[PDB]
Amino acid sequence: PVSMTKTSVDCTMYICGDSTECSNLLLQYGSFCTQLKRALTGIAVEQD
Amino acid sequence: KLIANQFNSAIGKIQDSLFSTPSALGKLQDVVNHNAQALNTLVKQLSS
Amino acid sequence: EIRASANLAATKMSECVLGQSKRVDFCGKGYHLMSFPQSAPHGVVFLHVTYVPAQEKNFTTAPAICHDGKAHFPREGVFVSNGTHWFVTQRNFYEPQIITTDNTFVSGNCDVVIGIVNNTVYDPLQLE
Amino acid sequence: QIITTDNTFVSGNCDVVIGIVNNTVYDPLQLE
Amino acid sequence: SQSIIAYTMSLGAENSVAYSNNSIAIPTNFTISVTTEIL
Amino acid sequence: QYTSALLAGTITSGWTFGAGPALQIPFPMQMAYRFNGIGVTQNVLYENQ
Ligand SMILES: *[C@@H]1O[C@H](CO)[C@@H](O)[C@H](O)[C@H]1NC(C)=O
Ligand SMILES: *[C@@H]1O[C@H](CO)[C@@H](O)[C@H](O)[C@H]1NC(C)=O
Ligand SMILES: *[C@@H]1O[C@H](CO)[C@@H](O)[C@H](O)[C@H]1NC(C)=O
Ligand SMILES: *[C@@H]1O[C@H](CO)[C@@H](O)[C@H](O)[C@H]1NC(C)=O
Ligand SMILES: *[C@@H]1O[C@H](CO)[C@@H](O)[C@H](O)[C@H]1NC(C)=O
Ligand SMILES: *[C@@H]1O[C@H](CO)[C@@H](O)[C@H](O)[C@H]1NC(C)=O
């Protein structure tokens, strides 16, 4: 193998389908999903 | 004599290339930035 | 990840620095000559001094030379000719030499190799 | 080993190399 | 007189050696270069 | 296309295209070279081509 498919999960849409209340609850949980987006970007660049 | 001059010129040029390049050592800086960012997020999360 | 890179750096040091590495495109691009390590904060930096060829001329080639019913093959290098005279030369540098019995080893019957080109080879022992 | 024509290959003009040292090399074919 | 353009990649400068049954090219000069590897 | 170029380099130029400018090589001679690279002389290939 040389690489895998590049996935670009976004926290807001995955964990809160178009719900502002859920979005606020996620936001109050702090920046737990910025790290997730950054890690996925890192692995994508790594496959490239 | 010729190869000695070539080697001296190349040794002179690598220094100027490292001086003038924006960041050719992006890997050490990359790991340093990664660790600093990870620690910074560890601290920042506590303010949630 | 850092330990994988550290193992790679240790192997690179032990091969390129403490000896010459025949592995192509391991210690710098091209044929490798030395490598001078340098220290860096939380890392290491090498100076892969590599040897790369230059201006090239294409002449002619023949896999073997048939002097007297027997094919001659070069002990090392190519059978090259600038158009009139056939020369044996080294691998990555043009050093033509007069074809003698020392530069070639004889084996065959001048009937099976494809691309054989007629010529004369010389000896030093008949003259003396 | 004694320096003979078998142990060495000759190439140059004795004017370009640095560190050249004079000596005598030997051959087996002149004797015979 | 300046703008951002988009184009398909170029994988490199197009080149082609000429394989001939009796063609050999041998370099007559040589160069020394010093690269850099950072780990 | 990358792999096609990589393959064209390794059949018309031997291995030199991995080091410097690519130099054309007759393929029987390249095979004789590789044979020379494992301890068998060129005559083996030029006789059993
Ligand atoms: C050498 O190769 C070049 C390729 O551009 C060709 O034009 C030339 O005729 C060749 N010379 C000989 C002597 O084969
Ligand atoms: C080929 O090389 C020989 C040896 O130096 C020289 O005498 C001759 O003139 C050369 N001829 C051509 C066509 O290059
Ligand atoms: C080479 O020389 C031999 C003997 O003189 C002759 O039989 C043969 O036809 C020649 N071949 C070529 C290609 O000149
Ligand atoms: C070596 O011998 C040659 C010829 O006899 C002479 O010209 C030269 O000066 C000598 N050099 C040394 C260092 O003895
Ligand atoms: C190489 O040999 C083949 C088969 O004999 C022939 O068809 C082709 O024209 C030859 N090419 C050259 C450049 O001699
Ligand atoms: C080889 O290249 C060097 C560097 O450009 C140059 O100084 C030298 O004259 C060249 N040698 C020949 C024989 O052209």
Q: How many CB pairs under 8 A join E and F?
A: 34
DSSP state of F41: -
Distance CA F6, CA F11 (A): 9
* Chains contacting B (3+ CB pairs below 8 angstroms): A, C, E
In single-letter form, the type of residue at position D9 comes to F
Distance CA A37, CA B12 (A): 43
Task: Decide: C and D in contact? Rule: 3+ Cβ pairs under 8 Å.
Answer: yes
CB atoms within 10 A of CB A24: 11
What sign does the dihedral C110-C115-C116-C121 (CA atoms) show? negative
Structure tokens at C25: 């495109």
Q: CB within 8 A of E16, min separation 6: which ones?
A: none
CB < 8 Å to C16, chain E: none
C119, with CB counted inside 10 A (0-12, 13-18, 19+), is middle
Q: 3-state SS string over D1-32?
A: CCCECCCCCCCCCCCCCCCCCCCCCECCCCCC
Distance CA A43, CA A3 (A): 10
Q: Are C100 and C61 in contact (CB under 8 A)?
A: no
Resolution (A): 3.8
Q: Which helix (H) or strand (E) holds C105?
A: strand C104-106
The values of phi and psi at residue C83, to 5°, are: 130, -35
Q: Could you give the angle at the alpha carbon of F27 between the alpha carbons of C117 and C28, nearest 5°?
A: 125
Determine the distance separating the centroid of ligand 5 and the alpha carbon of E19, expressed in angstroms.
Answer: 10
Q: In what order do the strands lie in the sheet containing C49-53?
A: C31-32, C49-53, E30-34
Distance CA A23, CA D9 (A): 82
Which is nearest to C73 in space by CA: A42, B10, F42, B13? F42
Which is nearest to E15 in space by CA: F12, F19, C57, C53? F12
